[PDB]
Motif scaffolding. Structure first.
Motif, mmCIF file in Angstrom:
data_model
loop_
_atom_site.group_PDB
_atom_site.id
_atom_site.type_symbol
_atom_site.label_atom_id
_atom_site.label_comp_id
_atom_site.label_asym_id
_atom_site.label_seq_id
_atom_site.Cartn_x
_atom_site.Cartn_y
_atom_site.Cartn_z
ATOM 1 N N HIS B 132 12.596 9.620 28.570
ATOM 2 C CA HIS B 132 12.728 8.498 27.769
ATOM 3 C C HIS B 132 13.755 7.510 28.483
ATOM 4 C CE1 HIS B 132 10.949 11.298 24.571
ATOM 5 N NE2 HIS B 132 11.868 12.049 25.321
ATOM 6 N N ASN B 133 13.642 6.116 28.041
ATOM 7 C CA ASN B 133 14.427 5.232 28.656
ATOM 8 C C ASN B 133 13.649 5.055 30.165
ATOM 9 O OD1 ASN B 133 15.750 5.308 26.210
ATOM 10 N ND2 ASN B 133 17.224 6.856 27.133
ATOM 11 N N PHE B 134 12.802 5.305 30.620
ATOM 12 C CA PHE B 134 12.490 5.371 32.196
ATOM 13 C C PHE B 134 12.287 3.987 32.247
ATOM 14 C CE2 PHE B 134 9.307 5.273 35.447
ATOM 15 C CZ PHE B 134 10.156 6.349 36.385
ATOM 16 N N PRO B 135 12.614 3.210 33.261
ATOM 17 C CA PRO B 135 13.255 3.635 34.174
ATOM 18 C C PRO B 135 14.814 3.813 33.824
ATOM 19 C CG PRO B 135 12.908 1.428 34.847
ATOM 20 C CD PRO B 135 12.444 1.710 33.569
ATOM 21 N N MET B 136 15.343 3.417 32.765
ATOM 22 C CA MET B 136 16.688 3.181 32.401
ATOM 23 C C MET B 136 17.129 4.464 31.837
ATOM 24 S SD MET B 136 15.913 -0.426 30.600
ATOM 25 C CE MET B 136 14.445 0.059 30.323
ATOM 26 N N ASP B 137 17.046 5.677 32.585
ATOM 27 C CA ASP B 137 17.371 6.951 31.937
ATOM 28 C C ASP B 137 18.712 7.474 32.994
ATOM 29 O OD1 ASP B 137 15.869 7.015 34.422
ATOM 30 O OD2 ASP B 137 14.905 9.070 33.686
ATOM 31 N N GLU B 138 19.471 8.282 32.329
ATOM 32 C CA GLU B 138 20.454 9.093 32.798
ATOM 33 C C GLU B 138 20.476 10.524 32.450
ATOM 34 O OE1 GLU B 138 23.390 10.586 31.318
ATOM 35 O OE2 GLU B 138 22.640 10.163 29.487
ATOM 36 N N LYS B 265 2.778 13.875 33.754
ATOM 37 C CA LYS B 265 1.968 13.333 32.713
ATOM 38 C C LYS B 265 2.577 13.914 31.235
ATOM 39 C CE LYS B 265 -1.516 13.442 35.822
ATOM 40 N NZ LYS B 265 -2.506 14.236 35.763
ATOM 41 N N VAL B 266 3.796 13.153 31.056
ATOM 42 C CA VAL B 266 4.523 13.204 29.908
ATOM 43 C C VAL B 266 3.734 12.744 28.874
ATOM 44 C CG1 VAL B 266 6.775 13.486 31.014
ATOM 45 C CG2 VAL B 266 5.804 11.141 30.536
ATOM 46 N N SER B 267 3.787 13.336 27.645
ATOM 47 C CA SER B 267 2.734 12.766 26.600
ATOM 48 C C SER B 267 3.767 12.185 25.632
ATOM 49 C CB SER B 267 2.028 14.089 25.951
ATOM 50 O OG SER B 267 1.474 13.625 24.563
ATOM 51 N N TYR B 268 4.360 10.988 26.068
ATOM 52 C CA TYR B 268 5.004 10.376 25.183
ATOM 53 C C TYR B 268 5.296 8.742 25.586
ATOM 54 C CZ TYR B 268 8.916 12.057 27.834
ATOM 55 O OH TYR B 268 9.720 12.595 28.606
ATOM 56 N N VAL B 269 5.404 8.007 24.888
ATOM 57 C CA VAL B 269 5.511 6.612 25.391
ATOM 58 C C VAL B 269 7.070 6.299 25.914
ATOM 59 C CG1 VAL B 269 5.652 4.312 24.429
ATOM 60 C CG2 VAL B 269 3.886 5.571 23.894
ATOM 61 N N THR B 270 7.154 6.109 27.410
ATOM 62 C CA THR B 270 8.357 5.739 28.020
ATOM 63 C C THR B 270 8.540 4.541 27.911
ATOM 64 O OG1 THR B 270 7.201 5.508 30.170
ATOM 65 C CG2 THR B 270 8.022 7.758 29.396
ATOM 66 N N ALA B 271 9.891 3.927 28.411
ATOM 67 C CA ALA B 271 10.209 2.844 27.909
ATOM 68 C C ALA B 271 8.993 1.713 28.710
ATOM 69 C CB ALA B 271 11.582 2.345 28.224
ATOM 70 N N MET B 272 9.359 1.934 30.404
ATOM 71 C CA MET B 272 8.406 1.029 31.054
ATOM 72 C C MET B 272 6.958 0.865 30.734
ATOM 73 S SD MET B 272 6.402 0.697 33.693
ATOM 74 C CE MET B 272 6.393 2.490 34.600
ATOM 75 N N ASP B 273 6.407 2.189 30.085
ATOM 76 C CA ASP B 273 5.111 2.354 29.781
ATOM 77 C C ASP B 273 4.821 1.560 28.498
ATOM 78 O OD1 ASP B 273 2.564 3.612 30.982
ATOM 79 O OD2 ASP B 273 2.407 4.502 28.760
ATOM 80 N N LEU B 274 5.857 1.339 27.681
ATOM 81 C CA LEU B 274 5.705 0.775 26.418
ATOM 82 C C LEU B 274 5.653 -0.605 26.785
ATOM 83 C CD1 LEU B 274 5.856 0.041 23.485
ATOM 84 C CD2 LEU B 274 8.422 0.314 23.522
ATOM 85 N N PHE B 275 6.585 -1.165 27.885
ATOM 86 C CA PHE B 275 6.582 -2.558 28.278
ATOM 87 C C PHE B 275 5.358 -2.901 28.723
ATOM 88 C CE2 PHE B 275 9.268 -6.290 29.557
ATOM 89 C CZ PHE B 275 8.564 -6.868 30.406
ATOM 90 N N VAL B 276 4.739 -2.193 29.627
ATOM 91 C CA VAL B 276 3.403 -2.433 30.344
ATOM 92 C C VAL B 276 2.290 -2.956 29.264
ATOM 93 C CG1 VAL B 276 2.671 -0.485 30.972
ATOM 94 C CG2 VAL B 276 1.956 -2.293 32.453
ATOM 95 N N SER B 277 2.399 -1.502 28.426
ATOM 96 C CA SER B 277 1.453 -1.966 27.283
ATOM 97 C C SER B 277 1.591 -3.083 26.522
ATOM 98 C CB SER B 277 1.725 -0.557 26.287
ATOM 99 O OG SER B 277 1.288 0.703 26.922
ATOM 100 N N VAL B 278 2.626 -3.676 26.128
ATOM 101 C CA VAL B 278 2.828 -4.812 25.353
ATOM 102 C C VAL B 278 2.382 -5.835 26.007
ATOM 103 C CG1 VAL B 278 4.517 -6.131 24.352
ATOM 104 C CG2 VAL B 278 4.914 -3.746 23.907
#
Ligand SMILES: *[C@@H]1O[C@H](CO)[C@@H](O[C@@H]2O[C@H](CO)[C@@H](O[C@@H]3O[C@H](CO[C@H]4O[C@H](CO[C@H]5O[C@H](CO)[C@@H](O)[C@H](O)[C@@H]5O[C@H]5O[C@H](CO)[C@@H](O)[C@H](O)[C@@H]5O)[C@@H](O)[C@H](O[C@H]5O[C@H](CO)[C@@H](O)[C@H](O)[C@@H]5O)[C@@H]4O)[C@@H](O)[C@H](O[C@H]4O[C@H](CO)[C@@H](O)[C@H](O)[C@@H]4O[C@H]4O[C@H](CO)[C@@H](O)[C@H](O)[C@@H]4O[C@H]4O[C@H](CO)[C@@H](O)[C@H](O)[C@@H]4O)[C@@H]3O)[C@H](O)[C@H]2NC(C)=O)[C@H](O)[C@H]1NC(C)=O
Ligand SMILES: *[C@@H]1O[C@H](CO)[C@@H](O[C@@H]2O[C@H](CO)[C@@H](O[C@@H]3O[C@H](CO)[C@@H](O)[C@H](O)[C@@H]3O)[C@H](O)[C@H]2NC(C)=O)[C@H](O)[C@H]1NC(C)=O
Ligand SMILES: *[C@@H]1O[C@H](CO)[C@@H](O[C@@H]2O[C@H](CO)[C@@H](O)[C@H](O)[C@H]2NC(C)=O)[C@H](O)[C@H]1NC(C)=O
Lengths: 50, 333, 99, 146
Positions: B132-138, B265-278
């Protein structure tokens, strides 16, 4: 359609030293388990020994 | 001369099957590491490579000798004849020592029975990245190790003052992450066999966004701001606006591919993927908005007139609001 | 200027071609986390294409209401964009071949 | 769902020379609940003990079985939503008045292009199972509609 071979034999012993023969009839000495078919693409129809 | 006699005596009447003080007290082992490097962290497999120099020091009163020489400094040759702890790394998918040109072990025996045993390891440790927070993850990925067969009442591990120390930290093969620090820890775990002292060396890593910015954020943002051009294009340029919208859709899908190409294939909405979807939803909305405007033309041109002026300001302002909320929420984590 | 569909298709399809080219080039590069020389070249080129289509957007917006200024801005864009690209290429190649 | 097993047997020793059992029989297998699969989820697992009868005799056997249920969120968001959105864009051609032929042709055929591009990229990224699947049926449905 393909005929994938499995050929084995003896290394280093010629026909006059080590002869191989199937323990039973040829096509009853190579048996594929009923659930033993792990192919996605092809369909194993049947074997043919010799 | 004398050292051969010393060694022959030491291994005479020895039994490497029994840990030092088998029945008396637990064997105390002081462990050190020297991380030569921390290789790539591939999120696809959830594993990180690490190259270290593992050193263990314990006390064996069977290996005590008296002589003018204070220390015996040997090769790997003797390693197989004396007792060595069965330390193993509990979170390693595949580890291996090095054997070129000669086994990379090291044995040293002091006067009083103190043995130091060092080897060089490359461990493919496993750590399940929470993407989560991809790519801003630690992340904080561990290297854990413990004895395999000896429970807490037979072998006890103990760190040192300068146990784990990194090297240059610049030659490391880290690509997208960045090294920030490490911690040492000790715990006792319950196993089917017994209670095992588990030692841990957490390494803290932070992903770096310099790549995903240029790859996805910038091109998706520019494609959206490009799709807005339809609003300023006159309403009569029907084929022009239609082609503009649909071509922007095609480009946006092309980008949305490379977006996820990187991750497992993580089955959840990562941050960058949310951004591109939006962004894709914004392009979709722009095209359907033009379609609805065009449809309303023939019925109510006065009603259609104000729609373009409304959209021109509602789309940019909406995108700026979304971007602000997004970049503020995902950086406050 | 009247060929609005034609110029719009240049704009959008050139953006798509540059998208594909940048994707392919950064696929060829390993997955480092910082900008390379090729990455800077790609970024500036993509900015140039975006600028071209934005110039069309503005010229079309002004056309049919202010042809004089529309043509004026179009002519300055013609004269300027190639010059700016050439100077960028010169400075880029100089700075990354001197090393 | 996939029913993945792990079978544990004795090679040479038969039942009248060796017997297998789970130590606890309910708590012999541990750590199944703590497993974190990025793409699947352990819904259930079972332990079985039996004696398989082969021609020469009965051999002991244990079996550890898992039931993996594949997660669907990733597939939805990356394969099903884009297809449906492109389908809607294809439908937009109807609202556009007929007389505009260039616009309607462009919309329709570029939606066909996008559908093909998505399908081919899904080929490229997804695992290569070379027989027909439900996702393949859905994409054919969408492409037929465009
Ligand atoms: C199923 O079957 C599998 C295959 O049969 C089987 O895998 C095999 O397991 C065995 C047991 O673990 C392995 O045998 C050991 O291998 C160790 C080396 O392992 C690394 O290297 C091998 C290749 O080995 C070469 O290199 C070493 C180091 O130089 C040499 O020592 C070897 O002899 C050999 O060198 C020959 O070949 C070279 C070319 O390769 C030539 O250049 C060279 O000149 C030689 O001709 C790799 O295969 C290994 O990779 C695999 O294993 C690792 C495990 O760590 C995996 O992680 C990896 O992914 C791979 O799977 C690995 O890279 C040997 O060191 C070891 O030998 C010592 O131990 C035995 C038993 O303890 C002793 O008898 C032996 O004498 C050695 O001890 C002496 O030397 C050590 C040196 O460390 C001293 O510390 C020790 O004190 C002792 O000294 C005493 O004896 C000396 C005599 O030599 C004497 O001189 C001294 O003075 C003193 O008296 C052992 O052989 C075997 O490699 C595996 N094979 C494979 C293919 O993996 C598997 O286990 C089976 N599974 C089950 C469930 O049964
Ligand atoms: C996954 O697949 C395996 C095998 O394909 C399934 O194992 C089957 O489990 C059932 C239920 O436990 C077994 O039925 C049992 O029959 C015996 C008769 O000997 C009876 O005593 C039991 O009370 C039960 O009715 C079945 O024999 C067994 N099959 C095999 C080949 O071992 C398993 O259930 C499937 N599901 C999971 C989650 O693993
Ligand atoms: C590494 O582990 C040690 C021991 O668990 C931590 O504590 C220090 O240990 C040395 C050696 O026993 C003592 O002399 C110090 O007084 C301990 N310091 C404490 C308790 O604050 C040490 O802090 C750990 N270091 C890291 C970086 O994890």
């Amino acid at each position: 359609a393909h005929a994938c071979p499995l050929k084995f034999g003896s290394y280093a012993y010629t026909r006059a030293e080590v002869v191989y023969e199937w323990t039973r009839e040829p096509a009853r000495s190579v048996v594929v388990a009923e659930d033993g078919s792990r192919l996605n693409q092809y369909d194993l129809l049947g074997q043919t020994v010799d | 001369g004398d050292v051969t006699v010393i060694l022959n005596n030491l291994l005479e009447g020895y039994d490497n099957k029994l840990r030092p003080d088998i029945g008396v007290k637990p064997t105390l082992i002081h462990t050190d590491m020297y991380v030569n490097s921390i290789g790539p962290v591939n999120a696809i497999n959830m594993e990180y490579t690490i190259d270290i120099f593992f050193a263990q020091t314990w006390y064996d009163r069977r290996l005590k000798f008296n002589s003018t020489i204070k220390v015996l400094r040997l090769n790997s040759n003797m390693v197989g004849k004396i007792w060595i702890p069965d330390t193993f790394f509990r979170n390693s998918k595949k580890a291996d020592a090095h054997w070129i040109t000669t086994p990379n072990r090291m044995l040293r025996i002091w006067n009083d029975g103190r043995v130091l045993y060092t080897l060089r390891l490359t461990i493919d440790a496993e750590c399940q990245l929470q993407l989560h927070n991809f790519p801003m993850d630690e992340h904080s990925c561990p290297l854990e190790f413990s004895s395999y067969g000896y429970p807490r009442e037979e072998i006890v591990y103990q760190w040192k003052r300068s146990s784990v120390e990194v090297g240059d930290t610049r030659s490391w093969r880290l690509y997208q992450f960045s090294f920030v620090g490490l911690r040492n820890t000790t715990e006792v775990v319950k196993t089917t066999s017994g209670d095992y002292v588990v030692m841990s060396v957490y390494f803290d890593l932070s992903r770096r966004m310099g790549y995903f910015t240029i790859q996805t954020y910038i091109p998706c943002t520019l494609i959206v701001v490009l799709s807005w051009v339809s609003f300023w294009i006159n309403k009569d340029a029907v084929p022009a606006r239609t082609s503009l919208g649909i071509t922007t859709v095609l480009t946006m899908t092309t980008l949305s591919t490379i977006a996820r190409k990187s991750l497992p294939k993580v089955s959840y909405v990562t941050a960058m993927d949310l951004f591109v979807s939006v962004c894709f939803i914004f392009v979709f909305s722009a095209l359907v908005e033009y379609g609805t405007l065009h449809y309303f033309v023939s019925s109510q041109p006065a009603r259609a007139a104000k729609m373009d002026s409304y959209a021109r300001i509602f789309f940019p302002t909406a995108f700026c609001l979304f971007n602000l909320v997004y970049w503020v929420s995902y950086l406050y984590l | 200027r009247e060929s609005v569909p034609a110029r719009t298709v240049f704009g959008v399809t050139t953006v798509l071609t540059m998208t594909t080219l940048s994707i392919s080039a950064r696929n060829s590069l390993p997955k480092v986390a910082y900008a390379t020389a090729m990455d800077w070249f790609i970024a500036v080129c993509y900015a140039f294409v975006f600028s071209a289509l934005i110039e069309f957007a503005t010229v079309n917006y002004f056309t049919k209401s202010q042809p004089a200024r529309a043509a004026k801005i179009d002519r300055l864009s013609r004269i300027a964009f190639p010059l700016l690209f050439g100077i960028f290429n010169l400075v880029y190649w100089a700075t990354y071949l001197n090393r | 769902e996939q029913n993945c097993t792990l079978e544990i047997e004795s090679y040479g020793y038969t039942t009248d020379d060796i017997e297998f059992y789970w130590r606890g029989d309910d708590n012999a297998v541990t750590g199944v609940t703590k497993i974190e699969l990025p793409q699947f989820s352990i819904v259930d697992y079972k332990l079985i003990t039996k004696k398989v009868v082969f021609s020469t005799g009965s051999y002991p056997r244990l079996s550890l079985s898992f039931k993996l249920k594949r997660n669907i969120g990733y597939f939805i968001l990356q394969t099903y939503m884009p297809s449906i959105l492109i389908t809607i864009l294809s439908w937009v051609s109807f609202w556009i008045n007929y007389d505009a032929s260039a616009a309607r042709v462009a919309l329709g055929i570029t939606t066909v292009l996008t559908m093909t591009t998505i399908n081919t990229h899904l080929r490229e990224t997804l695992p290569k199972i070379p027989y027909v699947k439900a996702i393949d049926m859905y994409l054919m449905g969408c492409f037929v509609f465009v």
